[PDB]
Design a protein around this ligand. Structure first.
Ligand SMILES: C=C1/C(=C\C=C2/CCC[C@]3(C)[C@@H]([C@H](C)CCCC(C)(C)O)CC[C@@H]23)C[C@@H](O)[C@H](OCC2(C#N)CC2)[C@@H]1O
Length: 254
């Protein structure tokens, strides 16, 4: 019963590697922000019309996401085993998980003090309204907040945070993949590491059940990924939208 096997040198290495990768791609100071198109916040205490009409926050948020995408790609390119897939299976995994990972790593800036994401600087504080001004409806934004709170109350160790993202990326069930068995093998190595860290390092532990809760989020993420895709498609229907985006955002979601 309740065996708690010690972490293997290889498993330790993997975490070290993943931890380090994340430090090199996540900026907790948010210093690069002034290099994005400026936030514009029109008063819209509504309007789906004002919103689409203006799209005042889109250029800034499209810039952030785009920037983050780049940081997510850099992270993927440091997952052990990720180099060993055909670059074709790499892009497929990347594109189809890019938004899921962003929602995970944004939790580092999400604050349960006012249910927002703070990257600033009141300028770089993002509340529900700030995402509607970017042309989004409550069907995605409201479930997203709950996801972040559900995620916060897991009280994840940074070690578990980086592994969750690593697993999210290297999923063998994504549409378009060629070598599902190889991708599957890497995920098991990553998932096994997670279950083992939980057993060894997490207090009490009377609840290694934490693992079941973490896999559940990855399923929330699929819903959100699909919902986002719906809403993106509406934005692209809006004329002049393309310039408010970036060629990366356009490629990934189009
Ligand atoms: C992306 C991140 C941040 C916020 C993410 C947010 C806050 C605004 C609300 C966002 C942007 C959602 C919407 C759906 C994004 C929509 C994007 C378009 C309009 C293109 O579809 C999804 C993710 C949400 C900010 C911050 O928490 C993180 O980025 C910070 C920096 C990085 N990397 C670390 C410096 C994280 O990577």
């Amino acid at each position: 019963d309740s065996l708690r096997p010690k972490l293997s040198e290889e498993q330790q290495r993997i975490i070290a590697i993943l931890l380090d990768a994340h430090h090199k791609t996540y900026d907790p100071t948010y210093s690069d922000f002034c290099q994005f198109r400026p936030p514009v916040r029109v008063n819209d205490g509504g309007s789906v019309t004002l919103e689409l009409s203006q799209l005042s926050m889109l250029p800034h948020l499209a810039d952030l996401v785009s920037y983050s995408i780049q940081k997510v790609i850099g992270f993927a390119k440091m997952i052990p085993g990720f180099r060993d897939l055909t670059s074709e299976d790499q892009i497929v995994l990347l594109k189809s998980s890019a938004i899921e990972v962003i929602m995970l790593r944004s939790n580092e800036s999400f604050t349960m003090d006012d249910m927002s994401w703070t990257c600033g600087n009141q300028d770089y504080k993002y509340r529900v309204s700030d995402v509607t001004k970017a042309g989004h409806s409550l069907e995605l934004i409201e479930p997203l907040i709950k996801f972040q709170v559900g995620l916060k109350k897991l009280n994840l160790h940074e070690e578990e945070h980086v592994l969750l993202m690593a697993i999210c990326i290297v999923s063998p069930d994504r549409p378009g993949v060629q070598d599902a068995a190889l991708i599957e093998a890497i995920q098991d190595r990553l998932s096994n590491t997670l279950q083992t860290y939980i057993r060894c390092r997490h207090p009490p532990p009377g609840s290694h059940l934490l693992y079941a809760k973490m896999i559940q989020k990855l399923a929330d993420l699929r819903s959100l990924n699909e919902e986002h895709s719906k809403q993106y498609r509406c934005l692209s229907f809006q004329p002049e939208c393309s310039m408010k985006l970036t060629p990366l955002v356009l490629e990934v979601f189009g």
